[PDB]
Each structure stands twice: as structure tokens, then as C-alpha cells.
Amino acid sequence: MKETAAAKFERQHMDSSTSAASSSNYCNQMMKSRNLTKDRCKPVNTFVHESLADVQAVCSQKNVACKNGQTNCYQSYSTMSITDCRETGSSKYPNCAYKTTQANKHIIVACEGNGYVPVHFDASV
Numbered sequence: 001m002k003e004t005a006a007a008k009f010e011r012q013h014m015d016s017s018t019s020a021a022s023s024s025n026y027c028n029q030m031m032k033s034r035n036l037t038k039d040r041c042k043p044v045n046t047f048v049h050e051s052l053a054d055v056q057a058v059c060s061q062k063n064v065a066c067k068n069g070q071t072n073c074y075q076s077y078s079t080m081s082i083t084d085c086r087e088t089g090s091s092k093y094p095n096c097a098y099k100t101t102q103a104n105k106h107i108i109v110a111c112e113g114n115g116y117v118p119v120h121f122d123a124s125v
């Protein structure tokens with residue numbers, strides 16, 4: 001079955017199963033279980049610990065520019081529980097290693113065609 005942009009966004013960024021990173025090993029486990037170390041060690045990736053509905057709602061909040069210059073990005077009005085994952089020095093494809101950083105920040109996502117479906121995670125602030 002084809003992986004839609006919606007499904008891909010959920011695979012790469014949604015973890016409503018936990019309220020926050022459980023430990024420092026969180027990223028290593030999640031990056032692997034979500035297939036983010038298969039085609040390479042995805043350098044950076046953020047997981048959101050909120051309901052899909054609250055993240056989806058961001059598409060109708062504060063409109064802002066995306067890091068790439070596109071105009072379909074949106075920043076959340078309130079802060080959200082998120083976990084930042086970044087490849088560390090001891091990492092080396094195919095043996096990927098990550099640093100886990102838990103936090104409560106505002107998220108910014110890109111909504112397809114400026115619609116209401118989040119398809120990319122731009123950043124957290």
C-alpha cells in the first residue's frame with residue numbers, strides 16, 4: 001500500500017503513545033523502530049507527544065514562512081511536549097546513534113497546499 005504524505009508525517013513525527021521521552025535512549029530506539037535509519041541515518045528528527053488532532057489543528061493557527069522559503073508553514077499557539085533527536089559523533093551508518101532532548105516548545109509544520117494536513121515538520125521554537 002502506498003504511503004501517503006499524511007501517513008509519512010505520522011510515522012516520522014507522531015508518538016502520542018508517550019507523554020515525554022522516557023530516557024536518554026529514546027531516540028536510538030524510536031529512530032530505528034520508525035524506519036528512519038534504513039536509507040541513511042536521518043540527521044535530525046522531532047517526535048511530538050500530543051494527539052494527532054492537536055497537531056493537525058496547527059494548520060489553522062499562526063501562518064509563517066518555512067525554513068526553505070515556502071509560505072505554507074504554521075506555528076502552534078501553545079507549547080507542546082516534543083523530543084528532539086540529533087545524530088551524534090559516535091554515530092556511523094548503518095550503526096546510527098542519537099542524542100535525545102525532551103522539551104516543551106511551539107512547533108512549526110508545513111501543511112500541504114496551505115490546506116489542513118501537516119506533511120512536514122519544519123522546526124520547534
Ligand SMILES: [Cs+]
Binds near residue numbers: 059060111114115116
Ligand atoms: Cs491553512
